[PDB]
Amino acid sequence: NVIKMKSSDFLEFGKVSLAFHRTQGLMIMKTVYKGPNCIEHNEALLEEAKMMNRLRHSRVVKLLGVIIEEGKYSLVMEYMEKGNLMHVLKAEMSTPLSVKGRIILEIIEGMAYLHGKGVIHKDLKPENILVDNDFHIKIADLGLASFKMWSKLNGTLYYMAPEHLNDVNAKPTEKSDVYSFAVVLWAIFANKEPYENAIAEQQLIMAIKSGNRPDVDDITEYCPREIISLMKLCWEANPEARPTFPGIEEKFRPFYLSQLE
Ligand SMILES: C[C@H](NC(=O)c1ccc(C#N)n1C)c1c(F)cccc1Cl
């Protein structure tokens, strides 16, 4: 079961607050609701939390607790000191090849874990890749794409597979996440968002659906050839042409090991 937490256990998407738990220290509280009583929801919510709490691995964030109070509902998640991946890439300092390589490996590990549990992320992107004080990463579902009830209770398209652009009814598959990961590889080397010279959303969506992809040229820092190859394979228009995360890991780990570790 999930840990039940109380708002009075604390000191000083949704209302996101760095909160100091009076016993366990710094955590992140995502208060998803404040308003009229709605106890009818409760059961479901609790259940959902438990389900989502079974997803435990070094490379995914932990649900530390839930607050289920009269008209106040909160998810409490571990605190990731360095914030999201894009924030980390965009700070004054910098990162060796080896470290960006490790970040990629840890992303692969996390996604392989989720897929091994039968869980499709659906919204993998740098905002959902959080970084600890030691530059190790954990994948998160901050937009609550998989927490259906908490989402109900309660938006870049740059990393979304083209089969979902202008088709919201198509079901996502593991390959949806593999595409997202390809654009993440790009962003890790460009240190910024793709498509900066797109005309506008409509035309850009149509261009991506017709095969346009992030500009490999706008990567001006060094990116290993096999990571360029990898991102191009993972963003193939045909989802069937994209590899699985196990296939990805079984190529990437020894490359990281033989050239980057
Ligand atoms: C295991 C991880 N859990 C959280 O992302 C999570 C835990 C606590 C909170 C909050 N708030 N989140 C978003 C998680 C899921 F549960 C479901 C789908 C993807 C991922 Cl990465």
The rounded radius of gyration (Å) of the Cα atoms in the chain is 19
> What is the CATH number for 1?
3.30.200.20
How many structural domains comprise the chain? 2
Q: Which residues line ligand 1 (CB under 6 A)?
A: 30, 52, 55, 60-61, 63, 75, 77, 114, 119, 121, 139-142, 146
Q: 77 C-alpha vs ligand 1 centroid, how far in Å?
A: 8
Shared domain check, 106 and 18? no
> What is the CATH number for 106?
1.10.510.10
Shared domain check, 107 and 23? no
Which domain range does residue 158 map to?
Answer: 80-261
Beta bridge partners of 75: 30, 66
Q: 141 C-alpha vs ligand 1 centroid, how far in Å?
A: 4
Shared domain check, 163 and 46? no
Q: 210 C-alpha vs ligand 1 centroid, how far in Å?
A: 33
Ligand 1 test: best mutation among 63, 122, 148, most atoms within 8 Å of CB?
Answer: 63
Domain C-terminal end among 45, 79, 113 = 79
Shared domain check, 95 and 69? no
Shared domain check, 1 and 86? no
Domain C-terminal end among 79, 108, 132 = 79
Shared domain check, 135 and 17? no
| Token pair in block for residue 35 | 């308003």
Shared domain check, 188 and 113? yes
Shared domain check, 181 and 68? no
Q: Provide the residue type at 143 as one letter.
A: G
* Closest ligand 1 atom to Cα of 128: 21
> 33 φ, ψ to 5°?
-150, 140
Shared domain check, 20 and 1? yes
**CA pair distance 98, 185, nearest whole angstrom:** 14
Known catalytic residues are 123
Domain C-terminal end among 79, 102, 124 = 79
From residue 109, give the alpha-carbon distance in Å to each of 95, 134, 177.
20, 17, 13
Q: Rounded to 5 degrees, what angle do the CA atoms 1, 129, 201 make? A: 120
Shared domain check, 153 and 64? no
**CA pair distance 144, 152, nearest whole angstrom:** 9
**CA pair distance 40, 68, nearest whole angstrom:** 12
Q: 198 C-alpha vs ligand 1 centroid, how far in Å?
A: 32
* Closest ligand 1 atom to Cα of 52: 16
Shared domain check, 234 and 166? yes
Query: Experimental method used, please?
Result: X-ray
Q: Is 14 annotated as a binding residue?
A: yes
